[PDB]
Design a protein around this ligand. Structure first.
Ligand code: ADP
Ligand code: A1JNK
Length: 488
């Protein structure tokens, strides 16, 4: 009752996101599988009982964390679920340990600012509690559908996985509501726990909300109009910029380019080119400390570590003053509340530095054992580590950041990636690790006509499910680059 006011006051301040949240927040697209946020838990024309679990699936960098943090802010402001919920607990999945034996009560007290919250007054009305589980795919370690026995005691301390699994399966607080956000890769795992979920898909910015971001970002109109014109003139960038992280990256790259007397131009055609163009803006240190940055990201992927403490990055080379050269330029950030923990600006940037590690001119650098771990939740699926390898390996493509890669080892990786394509194409009897469309996403990043032409001849037929204009772009490139032993 009176504590709800104290918790709401805390949620109002901690979710300010001054990395205002509102000052940059742009309307994200949400579709049921046109949904009004307030009626997410309201049952449909058929159901009489309300929805208890709602699943937000969306792209990497689409803004799942920003939507969760916006919901938290709007709720504590009064706007959202004023009469539907009394408590909204934000569970940052990357911070939750899958092995750490903890109770559901312990978890709720992590979301509380005070040391002694009234945990019994809080779980008094479970139906009035909504668990905002952010980043299910970001749960470090293996999340198995076989873990057990399940939990039905909120006070009982069970293994992190058993605890989260029991909450998802609605075994723990059955009438408490749940909002799980995740990339669609991990939806295979999540589907096996969900008790009648209502699926929703985050589809980034609309064609109008794309322009809107460019105008909330650029305080000047003459800057905003010119930066959006660069996106309109570029077919690939325009398509890519529905993803808000892509908008942030492009605007920040063009902002650094604007700082100099350099006429606006981004001739980027691949996701790898977008990340290499962005990183090259920050290269004025990130040249001598490139070995550390890549080894830290690779070690943090092989053993599932998003948050690296002071001791992780100290042993990796980057000292106390090097981390300041990465924080101010926007490459490293302080997370895990007011504690000395440093994680990458995004999981896609960690997967980028993990991919770059294998290509630096000198964990292990065996792409063979890296590719064997592809498609596993316990390793982060490695979707982007492989994609960035395909793009960086690109021989007929070089910038400043690409010139610091061994041309001898990037050729060996090129031949290894082509064998991996041949293996996946022929033995299609897999319960999906690299889908046929995902293999088209890998060949798109590659871009080289000598490689894509050879890699395309392995596929017997084209069987893919096109969903976004990106799917029909990436796969059309591969179809155009595929031609038989005598087609004509
Ligand atoms: N609606 C939005 N408005 C403004 N920026 C956004 C929005 N959604 C995402 N972002 C940008 O994307 C970045 C990462 O997105 P995030 O919400 O963490 O997505 P995900 O969890 O799907 O990777 C944010 O730090 C921010 O720069
Ligand atoms: C910041 C940022 C850059 C970026 C570039 C591409 C994508 C992306 N990648 N793959 C998609 N769908 C395929 C479908 C087949 C299976 N594979 C694994 C997934 C869809 C999207 C939007 N997300 C991105 N985020």
């Amino acid at each position: 009752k009176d504590y709800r006011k104290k918790y709401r006051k805390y949620v109002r301040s901690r979710f300010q996101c001054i990395e205002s949240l509102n000052k940059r927040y742009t309307r994200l697209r949400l579709i049921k599988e046109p949904i009004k946020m307030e009626l997410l838990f309201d049952p449909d024309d058929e159901h009489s009982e309300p929805v208890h679990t709602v699943v937000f699936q969306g792209a990497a960098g689409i803004g799942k964390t920003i939507l969760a943090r916006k919901m938290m802010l709007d709720w504590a402001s009064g706007t959202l679920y004023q009469d539907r919920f009394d408590y909204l607990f934000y569970i940052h999945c990357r911070e939750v340990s899958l092995v750490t034996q903890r109770s559901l009560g312990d978890l709720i007290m992590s979301c509380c600012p005070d040391p002694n919250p009234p945990i019994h007054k809080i779980v008094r009305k479970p139906s009035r509690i909504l668990f905002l589980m952010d980043g299910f795919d970001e749960l470090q370690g293996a999340f198995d559908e076989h873990i057990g026995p399940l939990c039905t005691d909120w006070q009982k301390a069970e293994r992190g996985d058993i605890l989260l699994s029991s909450l998802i399966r609605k075994k723990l607080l059955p009438e408490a509501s749940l909002l799980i956000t995740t990339r669609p890769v991990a939806l295979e795992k999540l589907q096996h726990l969900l008790d009648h979920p209502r699926h929703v898909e985050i589809l980034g910015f609309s064609e109008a909300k794309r322009k809107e971001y460019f105008f909330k970002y650029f305080s000047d109109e003459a800057q905003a109009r010119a930066a959006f014109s660069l996106i309109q003139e570029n077919e690939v960038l325009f398509t890519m910029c529905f993803i808000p992280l892509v908008c942030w990256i492009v605007c920040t790259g063009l902002k650094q380019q604007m700082e100099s007397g350099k006429s606006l131009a981004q001739t980027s055609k691949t996701t790898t080119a977008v990340y290499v163009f962005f990183l090259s803006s920050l290269l004025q240190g990130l040249c001598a400390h490139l070995w550390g940055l890549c080894s830290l990201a690779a070690d943090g992927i092989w053993n599932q570590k998003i948050l690296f403490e002071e001791s992780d990055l100290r042993n990796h080379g980057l000292q106390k003053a090097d981390v300041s050269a990465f924080l101010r330029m926007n490459l490293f950030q302080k997370e895990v509340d007011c504690e000395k923990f440093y994680s990458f600006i995004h999981m896609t940037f960690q997967e980028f530095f993990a991919a770059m590690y294998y290509l630096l001119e000198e964990p292990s650098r065996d792409v063979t054992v890296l590719l064997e771990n592809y498609g596993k939740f316990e390793k982060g699926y490695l979707i982007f580590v492989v994609r960035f390898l395909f793009g960086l390996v690109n021989q007929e493509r070089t910038s400043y950041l690409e010139k610091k890669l061994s041309c001898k080892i990037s050729q060996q990786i090129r031949l290894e990636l082509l064998k991996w394509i041949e293996v996946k194409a022929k033995a299609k009897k897999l319960q999906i690790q690299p889908s046929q469309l995902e293999l088209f996403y890998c060949l798109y990043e590659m871009q080289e006509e000598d490689f894509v032409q050879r890699a395309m001849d392995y596929f017997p037929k084209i069987e893919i499910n096109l969903s976004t204009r990106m799917d029909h772009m990436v796969s059309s490139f591969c179809i155009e680059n595929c031609h038989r032993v005598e087609s004509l």
